[model samples]
Target: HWGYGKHNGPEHWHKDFPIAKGERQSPVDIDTHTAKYDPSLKPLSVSYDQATSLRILNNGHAFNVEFDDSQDKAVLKGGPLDGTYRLIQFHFHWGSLDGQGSEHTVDKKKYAAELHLVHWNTKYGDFGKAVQQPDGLAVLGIFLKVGSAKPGLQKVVDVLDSIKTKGKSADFTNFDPRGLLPESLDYWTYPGSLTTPPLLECVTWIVLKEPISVSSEQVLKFRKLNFNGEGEPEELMVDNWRPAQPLKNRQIKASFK
Candidate 1:
């Protein structure tokens, strides 16, 4: 299985997917000193409509809330992006317990949780086709800390019960994805691959410098999620994050000083 288990964890992935060892892989350590100041980097421009929300599903990787990207209703542009990209889905990566979850880290410091909002470029027209090309995707990453309970996140957390198992989906709608961000738009940008399998090196990563707070109880629900469907004897869906890949001569740029 192409999952995060002992038999097929991040390290063992290279056996089947050689691209896992690609030069520009994702979930890298954001070392501050190594980051440079980019004067030309523009502020992020995010436009998300609540009506564009379609449904939420658990692909056994993470619970993803899908959106209607048929038009430019929900899109991400600017902020190291060449053109506007349509929002496809958004999901989170976490662990069973605290201190060892998130795929991306800052200065080698790991957070309790991480969120990913995935988007695809419109130039390719077809998402299935676009992913194969470099510079065809843009992912906005938000870190999560253990502190105050985020009221906005409750909407998504509350529905975890319905889709706790793999291959399960719930009808989720009318929610603006913008409410999930931190107060600051300041971020770090780089080129990387999908942290998961078939790690295509085609994503322009814009990781937010700030993190949203989540309650301890909410974090517990993430651990309760099942990696397997109702058929596979019910396994806990924890530690789905990939280890940080090598920078390999890549540069992390910041919009602010």
Candidate 2:
């Protein structure tokens, strides 16, 4: 629920979510010199059902895309995960500047930003109550790196102009989010807490080390999203990334063989 803008930026998150003070944050610079560790996670295959529908909402704080469970035929089965979990919502966390973004780090390196594909444990029955459980959620993290530039993100960026102002959101018709995923599905897996409030520690995180590129200009525009409610004029909300925290005793595993 963080946004880009003066007074309402990430720097102000601690005010509303006071618990942030004690939690292990992300977006840290990954130091490669640390002892190498491997995890024991596996990939869960998903099915695309015709009932799957997507909605991009300008939910006051950020552009959140929600998926209808009926249309979602995707099922996760493998690794530490055994039941079916349906796609729920997906959103982004970015910085005010192009040099920093991303919510998690390996060895402490920072990326331009990160996108989260959120899913809930369907085994729990309902998403509303399921999200509140310890093992209720799963999120896929994709790092956004600033470099030579790539147009692969245009599907999401093209609509920014319409929702540029706060409190403003238009229905994004006929868009497939699966297209946004990187060709390389390889990822790093671990158990962690939510980056947002409640900071629940029940999340299973899968982070892709291979980043997809976007122009610095595209990133600059992302910073233009306002922190205030929808329909309000755009404000600068860059540098919304949180610094990475210690791994404690947690183990992280990668898909690479």
Candidate 3:
């Protein structure tokens, strides 16, 4: 099981997935001081066709809200991208406690949770083919802090009980993901890999500077999910975030001054 347990946690992943130790791995610490502000960087453009939302699933690791990627109904453009990147799915990484959970940290400071909106370059045909290439993915990261409950996140959290155990999913439609974002589109962009196994270095990460709010109660709902499938030894799916890796010869550019 590729879980966050002592036997198969982040530290041991390198054994099965050699690229786990790769230079450009993901979930890095965004040191604001080192991030340079660039005027040339265009403002990010995000358009979601709410109808494109299809289903949400608990894959034992995290709960993902999948979208219809057959066409570019919902896509991510601009901000360090050459063309349109179709939205595929979105998920979150969290921990057992409110103090830490996010995959990417800011100035080495951890957030309560981190949201990832995954997209794939249409140029590479499909996600499978694109993932093997360098410019294949663009993941939008939004840090979640403990505060008043976020209305945008309630829909997702409300369905947690239905998929409490691993390998459960349900039809989730007409859900507008845009509601989950912060007011400011200002962000930090960098080149990195997938935070999970088969950590392909194909993602251009765009992490928003502003954070959204999620109450402690909502955070607990995520922690209630089990890492093990139905009938297996009950293991809570907490701390699903991969710790920050070394930046390693990469420059993080900011869209704001």
C-alpha TM-score for every candidate: 0.98, 0.81, 0.98
Poorly placed runs, candidate 3 (over 4 Å): none
lDDT of 1 by residue, 8-75 (tens): 78889999999988799998999998799999998999887533888989999899999998888888
lDDT of 3 by residue, 1-257 (tens): 57788888999999889999888999899999989999999999998854389998999899999999998799999998999999999999998889899999998899999999999999999999999988999999999999999998899999898998888999999899988989999999999999998899999999999999998889989989998889899998999999999989999999998
> Alpha-carbon error at 140 in model 2, in Å?
0.2
RMSD per candidate (Å) reads 1.0, 3.3, 0.9
What lDDT would each prediction earn against the true structure?
Answer: 0.90, 0.65, 0.92
Among these predictions, the greatest lDDT belongs to: 3
Model 1 scores worst on lDDT over the 10 consecutive residues at: 45-54
Clash count of each predicted structure: 0, 32, 0
RMSD of 3: 0.9
Alpha-carbon lDDT of model 1: 0.90
lDDT of 3: 0.92
Residue 6 lDDT (model 2) = 59
